[PDB]
Amino acid sequence: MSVQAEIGILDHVDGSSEFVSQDTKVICSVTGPIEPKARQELPTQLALEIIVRPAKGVATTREKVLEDKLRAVLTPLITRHCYPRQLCQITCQILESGEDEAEFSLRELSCCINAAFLALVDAGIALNSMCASIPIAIIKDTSDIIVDPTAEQLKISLSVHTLALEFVNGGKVVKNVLLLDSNGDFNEDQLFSLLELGEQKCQELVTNIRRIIQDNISPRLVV
């Protein structure tokens, strides 16, 4: 869980970030609230334009799924009723997969969730709470649950998991499970053991994120 992030790296965007876990590096940018296109307009709430760009080649249907899952996480996080008939552009440029993209998209999704959240924080957009996402995997010979697995570990995995939780009260109370994307062969006992260990490492991540956010933003503010 030795992640590293930077905040406010882009000039022509309201907010930006660069999240790095292992070899997975994703840069994200957020502009909003701004004027929306007519087809995007929502009478009462904020409209989200979510874009995911791959590390190699052009955006395909694969990234279209990454956009969809990332939408399921960011939508309830943002206090959308504060910005009626308005738009918020959220762009993720995956710079380095950190995994075999022909087989997995686990680490890229988690890194996009964490980066998007950080970019939303930087942009100063109304959020109902905080959030953290981690990738998890299981190995058949080992029987182990490995949090933040490497690319080599994924190759020999039986199941891959993306867990993103919603935290409140100083990152101590799990408000809800924003996203759990479990793929592969697994049983009910493995699922809850995954959720128990997953919640712990997620809570540790929020604490680390809270540290990063305060370290970067506080110099900008005044005492």
Partner 1 sequence: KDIEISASESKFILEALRQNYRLDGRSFDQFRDVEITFGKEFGDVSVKMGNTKVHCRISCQIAQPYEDRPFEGLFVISTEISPMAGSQFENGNITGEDEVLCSRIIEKSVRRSGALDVEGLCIVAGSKCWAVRADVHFLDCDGGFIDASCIAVMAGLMHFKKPDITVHGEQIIVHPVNEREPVPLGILHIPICVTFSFFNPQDTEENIKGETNSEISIIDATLKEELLRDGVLTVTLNKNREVVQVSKAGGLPMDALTLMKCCHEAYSIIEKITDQILQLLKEDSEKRNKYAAMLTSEN
Partner 2 sequence: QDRRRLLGPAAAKPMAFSNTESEQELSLHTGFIENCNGSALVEARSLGHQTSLISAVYGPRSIRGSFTSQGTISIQLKNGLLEKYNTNELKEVSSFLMGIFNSVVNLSRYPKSGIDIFVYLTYDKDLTNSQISSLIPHCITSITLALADAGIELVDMAGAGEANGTVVSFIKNGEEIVGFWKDDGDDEDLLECLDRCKEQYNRYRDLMISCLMNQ
- Least Cβ distance, residue 39 to RNA (angstroms): 5
12 in contact with RNA (CB under 7 A):
no
User: What's phi and psi for 196, nearest 5 deg?
Assistant: -75, -50
Measuring CA to CA, how many Å separate 31 from each of 48, 86, 99, 127, 214?
A: 10, 11, 29, 15, 21
Phi, psi dihedrals of residue 159, rounded to the nearest 5°: -155, 150
Max Cα distance, the chain (Å): 55
Binding to partner 2 in span 30-69, by CB under 8 A: 58-61
Smallest distance, partner 2 to C-beta of residue 223, A:
50
Per CB under 8 A, 162 contacts partner 1: no
Q: Which of 39, 220 has the CB closer to RNA?
A: 39
Q: What whole-number distance in Å separates Cα of residue 119 and Cα of residue 93?
A: 12
Of 7, 24, 16, 37, nearest to 212 by C-alpha is 7
Binder to RNA among 2, 11, 12, 39 (CB under 7 A)? 39
Which partner, partner 2, partner 1, RNA, none, binds residue 38 by CB below 5 to 8 Å per kind? RNA
**What does 139 bind: RNA, partner 2, partner 1, none (CB cut-off 5 to 8 Å by kind)?**
none
Residue list 73-102, contact with partner 1 (CB under 8 A): 89, 91, 93, 95-96
CA distance 75 to 101: 26
C-beta neighbour count of 175 within 10 angstroms: 15
Please pick, from the candidates 38, 102, 221, 222, the single residue that binds RNA as defined by CB under 7 A. Answer: 38
Our finding on whether 222 is near RNA (CB under 7 A) is no
Q: Among residues 49 and 96, whose Cβ is nearest to RNA?
A: 49
Q: Which of 123, 107, 119, 100 is nearest to 209 (CA)?
A: 119
Q: What are the structure tokens assigned to 126, written together?
A: 């109304």
**CA-CA distance, 97 to 51, in Å (whole number)?**
16
List residues near partner 2 by CB under 8 A. Answer: 58-61
List residues near partner 1 by CB under 8 A. Answer: 10-13, 16, 23, 27, 29, 31, 34-35, 49, 51, 53, 55-59, 89, 91, 93, 95-96
List residues near RNA by CB under 7 A. Answer: 38-39
